[PDB]
Write a protein that binds this ligand. Sequence first.
Ligand SMILES: O[C@@H]1[C@H](O)[C@H](O)[C@H](NCc2ccccc2)[C@@H]1O
Ligand SMILES: *[C@@H]1O[C@H](CO)[C@@H](O)[C@H](O)[C@H]1NC(C)=O
Ligand SMILES: [Zn+2]
Length: 1014
Amino acid sequence: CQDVVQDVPNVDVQMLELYDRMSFKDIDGGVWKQGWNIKYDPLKYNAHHKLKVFVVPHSHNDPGWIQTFEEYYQHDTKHILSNALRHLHDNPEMKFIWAEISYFARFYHDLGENKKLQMKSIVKNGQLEFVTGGWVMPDEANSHWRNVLLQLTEGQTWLKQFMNVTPTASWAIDPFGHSPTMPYILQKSGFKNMLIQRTHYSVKKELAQQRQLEFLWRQIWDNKGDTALFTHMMPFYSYDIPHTCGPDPKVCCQFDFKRMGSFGLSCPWKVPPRTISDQNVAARSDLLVDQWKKKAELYRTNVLLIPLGDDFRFKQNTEWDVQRVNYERLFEHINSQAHFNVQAQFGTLQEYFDAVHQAERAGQAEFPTLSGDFFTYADRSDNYWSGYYTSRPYHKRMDRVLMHYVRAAEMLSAWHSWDGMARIEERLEQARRELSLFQHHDGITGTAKTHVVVDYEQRMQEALKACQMVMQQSVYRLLTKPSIYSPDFSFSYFTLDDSRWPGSGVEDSRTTIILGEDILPSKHVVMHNTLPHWREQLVDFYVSSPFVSVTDLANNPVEAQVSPVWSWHHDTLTKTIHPQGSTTKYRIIFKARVPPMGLATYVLTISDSKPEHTSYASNLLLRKNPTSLPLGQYPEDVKFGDPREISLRVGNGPTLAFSEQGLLKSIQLTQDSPHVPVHFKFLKYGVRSHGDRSGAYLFLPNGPASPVELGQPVVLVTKGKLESSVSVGLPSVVHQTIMRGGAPEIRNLVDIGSLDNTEIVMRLETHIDSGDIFYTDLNGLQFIKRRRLDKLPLQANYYPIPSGMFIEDANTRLTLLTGQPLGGSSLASGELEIMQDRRLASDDERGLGQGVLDNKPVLHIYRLVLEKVNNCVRPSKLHPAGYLTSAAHKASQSLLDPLDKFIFAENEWIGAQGQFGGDHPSAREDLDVSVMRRLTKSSAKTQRVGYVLHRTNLMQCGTPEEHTQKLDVCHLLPNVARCERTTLTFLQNLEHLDGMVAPEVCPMETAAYVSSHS
Ligand SMILES: O[C@@H]1[C@H](O)[C@H](O)[C@H](NCc2ccccc2)[C@@H]1O
Ligand SMILES: *[C@@H]1O[C@H](CO)[C@@H](O)[C@H](O)[C@H]1NC(C)=O
Ligand SMILES: [Zn+2]
């Protein structure tokens, strides 16, 4: 295995180093506004060396943005595809590329057989070519890598099944900045090439000057280069026709033949296109070939890519004709005029890349190696697109909840083969497709219109219900004696209980377990652990009595804690935010221990008085002017006091100190150690009163944030043997610090209310001497080093925080893990900050046509891990990556993939069993089974199950922590007959494995395996 820590890769372009050197001046470069006046030597191309030009027609079809997926399909996309089928069939030299398989599958299944056959024929002959082949063109900032892979696999599995093709070239013209997670996944999914577009205008200028727009993009820790993927970055401001023929949009706009008037489009540079004729074709060709030769100067081969398209183009038959006939006249002239030394034709993306690599093999060019990312994007001036790292945070959090529920549903149901009447495949396909659709670059990014966001939410809610159904049928089958198991596939044997989604104060969605001497003495509950190691985690349930005790299924008592159910209320009468306790529902909390990828059953039993193994939390309400807080049968009366600083310690864990406003002020790791200053603070950013306004995409603050004025907030302290917490009602945020014995969990119930033009940020202030360095993750896959640059504006120093961020010095590190993607930064040494929500009254001029005024309460979750790192083996100062410690990685897993909780729904569970998976191997902590999916329906003689195995890389800090089992996923199901390593989409077999054993993977690697069973 390659060492991902100690060897700094040698690359030609390392983006962090490039950023440190670049000046980012925004000067007027002439017609290429952000470039320079390109010059070329007319003698470069000649009879023996012609410029080969591929004009690639395309149509960017957003699966929701200003209209919903279905509205665009009915109004635009079905017409584009129907006319592409007709026009390509009738014009054999015409070509077209298609990216979004969600729309293609929606169209194809509505086609009659004759047209399906015609469609297959234009794909098979190369006229219609799929690029990427994912369900969508995903956001690359907020998306988790697991969901980028899910949506890629959904689209490519559909293409293999129905079109018999698997794209090896990727097209990503619209995500708002780009992540190396893409080439990581694509290269392990059979790809050979990829194309990107939205990168900072200063980066395009710098790379263009060095002809480094095509490069071998490798991961930041890859010393050898085996992860490298050839990448083409487009050079100009946009992917539309005006910014794709060459450097001068005035000129290129004249070659967009949809802009002469009858289509309602025009050229803003004020010169319209003119129909090509024999009287003007030589002058029009002179102008166009000059643009092409200028664009060609920015690249190293004699093969030039000219995209020809825009949003929802190629819709009308007349548009197909106007673009095709005019370009055919230009090609016929140009290709026959030897003096141009050009051969131009319609082409596809793969045709472009194949010709570039033929040139490279002929020795005509060598390409530079590059590592790093392309965040944060700015398309012009100081307009940095860091707002969408936070926009519509409720749905950003929902993405991570559904991510986990899809994984758990696919894994729980993979253990068995199911009759078609159980509708398991149907519900999992719906869930995978709705989650995949949301990965679109206007879905999770929060950049769609309000009614489109509602559509995505409704689709994800349906997907969650589908996952719950599959999960609860699976648990019933896995834990019921086989000869007693009697399923009704439409029945709810268990309901899921989720404590953090939508969350307390967001929705009253949780069911209370109703127990009573005159109704039901006890209730079974079951926990599922999707991770491949034994895991303990505290779990809680709402119960109708405080006198409840827990037992495992061998009837062994389990220590438990009962706490009240507290809800916070903005009291419009007293004008205070304060908690109210329930007098009939209580929370019972206990430690569940669950096998790797397994299930564990417990029983909750009511008693007439305090049970021997159940303790009760104390509660202290700190506020001036308190009033009583009755809790029914709860055995401990609530205590009151004036606001004051307080300290808490659960177990042998850290001791946390809090200010009189209920916010953390210090963390003491052990009895002897120092109280390390770690202060939480809430602040607000505003919007500019003149100039450009923040909106869904852009963050354009009116200066550094100002502290939220807190008043004298009400603080609630709950102290228990298993769990304690400090909660405070701040303006727009009920902030909660929860302690269970290890790093605390932070929960924020964020309700920005009617605060227009406000962004609420949560900041951590420490004295850690981090300087200008911090680390943020990319798609939940890797941590990349960031350097704050005071030569760039505040918003340029914000980066995506898809799952975590940290700062460190020689001795100390503070890591904040998140349960949802948000934007964040470190704006000064010792600080971390992460945006909670943003409400904006103005549109930011990117086409959305609205601000963001549809905020709703959201419960954000985090873990805060303060650690000593002076003993850790860390990368050298010049390495671009960072790595988590074991405790921070486990904390992230606790947020993203917690235990699932099931409540048996009827009175008696006949045939109940206590555990499933006790014999599953407990794999080393850095290894995960990211995906377990049965790939065959029950009628297949040979069953196939696919696994995606990911190993992260954790710092070695001196903990022996060893003795684990080898996990061979191919032997998890019985009767294995073959084991194969495959691409990550499971679509191509790469290696037939000896002894049917699937080897574990190296740190930072991801592999896929499929086991076949008779
Ligand atoms: O994803 C949606 C938005 O967020 C924007 O990116 C739109 N494209 C706008 C556009 C049109 C022509 C060229 C470049 C961008 C649309 O595709
Ligand atoms: C699918 O594509 C391959 C490669 O072109 C071809 O040989 C095969 O016949 C096609 N259809 C089948 C039989 O899967
Ligand atoms: Zn788009």
